[PDB]
């Protein structure tokens, strides 16, 4: 199990090979943030796989130099490039050499023989390496490394440095210069170390912190200040100073952030009349169907749940799960009655009697085919319904053919009347209650729509959610898009109106189309952050002033200037020292 501890200042390294002198330099580079968790480990009486993340850190406390190895990569089957590093009798021995792995890669050590510890070939860490895209050869103490893959460059850094501490990373600051760069080109996702089997070691994970760094005369980093560590350490990154003299500074800007979101589309009122399509008592026939365009309405696809509903609701263009927010453009419900087995003949990549002659939908067609049984209703039987039995060829997409001309089977002209080899193209279905389910006329609709690529008229049905007040949220109201804090208001909006607005033209109010009421708006918060500090010559204790806000969204006080954290109010009044605002002056005294 991990037994954590506190990183302190460890893991600062020269981000490049440049030299400088006595110049505070703010660099934004993956580091080990100050004062964070470090997953710790042992060698006792233990070296699992870890994540490699963006980079790593490392250390160990070696009198005996037992932690000698590293194995990185994606997999550890060799299906990656399998990196490696080994350290033998002070001789640096590296590879990328790639092999089949093992369960307990390790190193052997023996007790008190002529050759110390023996097992210098111990090295059943894997089976055998093959294709090597690089090669090389060569508590009292402390090691520190850093391993980060960037631009195919797996870097390394190090300090082999003495200490006296048993328990943890000593407190202190030492930069890490680079040793190597390998252009290995792997992407390491993990790794494992390799112990010496009869020695603590640590791990961080590099994060994109921004440090202020202080080079010295010789150009050895003597010190650093994380920017994001805490209120004060952002005032040193602003000033580029390790001495922050007295008085109020300004660093960051905090912005309250949206809770979830609010969609609003008018409920009820009017919608896309799916019912004025679907429950029409008699649909048009199959040779001639009903194309009824649907435009500029909140879609009705809700109510399609509770009803007799459909024989099937089947979407050939797009998922019905998409349809809800999916914005159509040109909406066409295809309203007609056919015999039952012909719902199989209305679909893309489908042939048969219907799809060839009296009704056609594309094989790239965009829509949803809908049908349900009219056995209960249309029949009495029902001869109002009919199909075109013969035509000379196969139809085009969306050609309603109402032409009643007689199909001529033979060479002799029919002269407009039936006869030998003259077939009446239009054959009715008698729907008789004594005929089965496959013969049942199904009451058929097909959504025929364009998806995107035409301007916005119809959207999917209402995704409009519930409404939340007095709480910073994101919202969209009927195409009005914005972010703010909705409340109840008293501004009497005009009945035929929609938006309120303001003197700078910015939206100042709205109306809720589902229940008409007047909601104000208001930006999130803003305010700047102002660190109020006595000089770092005196105390690292700072007192932050969040300006121009009310104290929630954050020992708290409240000013006329803003939300002031970390300074106890005082009923005295003294001469001004560090002025804050609205006549409130801080100071450092007891």
């Amino acid at each position: 199990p991990p037994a954590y501890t506190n990183s302190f200042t460890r893991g600062v390294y020269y981000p490049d090979k440049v030299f400088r002198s006595s110049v505070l330099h703010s660099t934004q580079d993956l580091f080990l943030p100050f004062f964070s968790n470090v997953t710790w480990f042992h060698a006792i009486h233990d070296n699992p796989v870890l994540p490699f993340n963006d980079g790593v850190y490392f250390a160990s406390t070696e009198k005996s130099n037992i932690i000698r190895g590293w194995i990185f990569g994606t997999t550890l089957d060799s299906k990656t490039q399998s990196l490696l590093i080994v350290n033998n009798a002070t001789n640096v021995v590296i590879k990328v050499c790639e092999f089949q792995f093992c369960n307990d890669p390790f190193l052997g050590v023996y007790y008190h023989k002529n050759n110390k510890s023996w097992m210098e070939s111990e090295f059943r860490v894997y089976s055998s390496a093959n294709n090597c895209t690089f090669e090389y050869v060569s508590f009292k103490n402390l090691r520190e490394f850093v391993f980060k893959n960037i631009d195919g460059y797996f870097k390394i850094y190090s300090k082999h440095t003495p200490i006296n501490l048993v328990r943890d990373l000593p407190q202190g600051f030492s930069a890490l210069e680079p040793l190597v760069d390998l252009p290995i080109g792997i992407n390491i996702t993990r790794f494992q170390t390799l112990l010496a089997l009869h020695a603590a070691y640590y791990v961080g994970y590099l994060q994109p912190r921004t440090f202020l760094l202080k080079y010295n005369e010789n150009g050895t980093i003597t010190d650093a200040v994380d920017c994001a560590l805490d209120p004060l350490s952002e005032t040193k990154c602003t000033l580029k100073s390790f001495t922050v003299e007295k008085g109020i500074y300004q660093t960051s800007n905090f912005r309250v952030q949206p809770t979830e979101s609010i969609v609003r589309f008018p409920n009820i009122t009017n919608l896309c009349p799916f019912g004025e399509v679907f429950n029409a008592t008699r649909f048009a026939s199959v040779y001639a169907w009903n194309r009824k365009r649907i435009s500029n309405c909140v879609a009705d696809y809700s109510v399609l749940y509770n009803s007799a509903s459909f024989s099937t609701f089947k979407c050939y263009g797009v998922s019905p799960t998409k349809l809800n927010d999916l914005c159509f453009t040109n909406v066409y419900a295809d309203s007609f009655v056919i015999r039952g087995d012909e719902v199989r003949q209305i679909a893309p990549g489908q042939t048969g009697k219907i799809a060839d002659y009296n009704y056609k939908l594309p094989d790239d067609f965009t829509g949803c085919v809908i049908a349900w049984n009219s056995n209960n209703l249309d029949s009495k039987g029902n001869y109002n319904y009919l199909y075109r039995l013969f035509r000379k060829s196969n139809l085009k997409p969306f050609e309603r053919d109402i032409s009643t001309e007689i199909y001529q089977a033979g060479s002799t002209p029919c002269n407009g009347v039936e006869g030998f080899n003259c077939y009446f193209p239009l054959q009715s279905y008698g729907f008789q209650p004594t005929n089965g389910v496959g013969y049942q006329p199904y009451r058929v609709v097909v959504l025929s729509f364009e998806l995107l690529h035409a301007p916005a008229t119809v959207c999917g049905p209402k995704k409009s959610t519930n409404l939340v007040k007095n709480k910073c949220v994101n919202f969209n109201f009927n195409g009005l898009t914005g972010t703010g804090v909705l409340t109840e208001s008293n501004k009497k909006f005009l009945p035929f109106q929609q938006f309120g607005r303001d003197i700078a033209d910015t939206t100042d109010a709205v109306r809720d189309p589902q229940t008409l009421e007047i909601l104000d708006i208001t930006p999130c918060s803003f305010g700047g952050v102002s660190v109020i500090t006595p000089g770092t010559n005196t105390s690292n204790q700072v007192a932050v002033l969040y300006q121009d806000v009310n104290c929630t969204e954050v020992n708290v006080f409240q000013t006329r200037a803003g939300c002031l954290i970390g300074a106890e109010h005082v009923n005295n009044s003294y001469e001004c020292d560090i002025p804050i605002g609205a006549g409130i002056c801080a100071s450092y005294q007891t």
Partner: antibody
Amino acid sequence: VQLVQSGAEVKKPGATVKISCKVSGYSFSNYYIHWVKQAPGKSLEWIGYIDPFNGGTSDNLKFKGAATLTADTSTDTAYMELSSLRSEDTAVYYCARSEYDPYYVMDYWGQGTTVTVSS
Amino acid sequence: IVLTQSPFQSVSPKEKVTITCRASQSISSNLHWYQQKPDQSPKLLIKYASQSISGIPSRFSGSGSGTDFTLTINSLEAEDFGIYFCQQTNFWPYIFGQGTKLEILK
């Protein structure tokens, strides 16, 4: 006729268990593959039928995992990748071959995919 | 589309068990049936509620009238026991029958 599916899983709530159902013994393209949710200690509950030629699929409202049934015609695999995962999304999900009409006839489903969805 | 089945019916060998799928509100002629032995792929007994799909024994039979949809099972055998599911057809997506666990006496 025959369906080979994804392996056993333990899934985070909110994660996505991707259950492949690969068509063997019949033609992927001629059949809706229905999907059904049998959770441990529960009965069959409809989630959705896929169409093999038609990416658009009816999904269940009910429990809604934003289930998207993707019809893979190269490997003849109807996928159910169930998002919005939950301890009740621990379940044996049977992909069910059936006709492409409003004829839904499903006999030998997937062998079952025993997928725990849990923390 | 709402239906429900009896949670279980415990019947005796050689007795006939007609398992009830009773649909709420609207109904269509098509309906389907199952037996599922625990933790197994449900096997379709009946098709369109009027047809036992091929491969299903003659003791498993099916019918329906209005809201009533029946799996008529006859002369139980001690090995037969399982969980019996039904399927509402059309009229919007479906509630599978909650199943009949077959507990056979004797």
